């Protein structure tokens, strides 16, 4: 089997601290257990789901928006935090939270892709692929944050029912 293989692939190209899509697969009684890529599945303990009997807030089919905590390749296993993920939220875009760490560095600074001439504001010749990837990825993590935007008013929603 190829479940170590599979698990390292995801941990290494989804590390610990990112906001990562996800779908509630099934209820537990400890928690929710959420699919995040094919094949790959993580917990959010009960004590994780908000920030706030677990259909109390979430059901299967359910996107959701999680933030890696933990990943062990050790037992397999991935640590997941509904909760964790929005305390993080802004509703201003970082986009280093949504699967573009990497164009960031150690102090924070935007690191530009090579291809791309910060001055004149355009790419360079030569650089077609690498500005596709770019934009692939920078719409992703747009999305990412749009879905968790529509968590937070699904979440704030809910609760201005409850609490009238």
């Known amino acids: 089997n190829l479940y170590f293989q599979h698990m390292r692939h995801f941990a290494r190209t989804h590390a610990i601290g990112q906001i990562v899509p996800g779908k509630v697969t099934k209820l537990v009684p400890f928690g929710a257990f959420v699919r995040v890529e094919e094949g790959i599945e993580g917990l959010v303990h009960i004590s994780e789901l908000s920030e706030r ?3 109390q807030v ?3 089919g359910d996107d959701a928006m999680v933030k890696v905590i933990d990943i062990d390749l050790e037992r397999r296993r991935i640590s997941l935090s509904l909760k964790q993920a929005n305390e993080d939220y802004t509703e201003e875009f970082d986009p280093s939270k949504y699967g573009m760490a990497d164009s960031y560095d150690e ?4 690191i530009f892709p090579e291809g ?4 004149t504001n355009e790419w360079l010749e030569g650089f077609d692929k690498q500005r596709e990837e770019w934009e692939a990825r920078y719409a992703e993590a747009e999305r990412r944050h749009k879905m968790h935007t529509a968590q937070m008013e699904k979440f704030a929603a809910a609760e201005a029912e409850a609490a009238n």
């Open 53 to 55: 009997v677990p259909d």
């Open 107 to 110: 102090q924070g600074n935007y």
């Open 58 to 60: 979430v059901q299967v």
């Open 116 to 119: 791309f001439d910060p001055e």
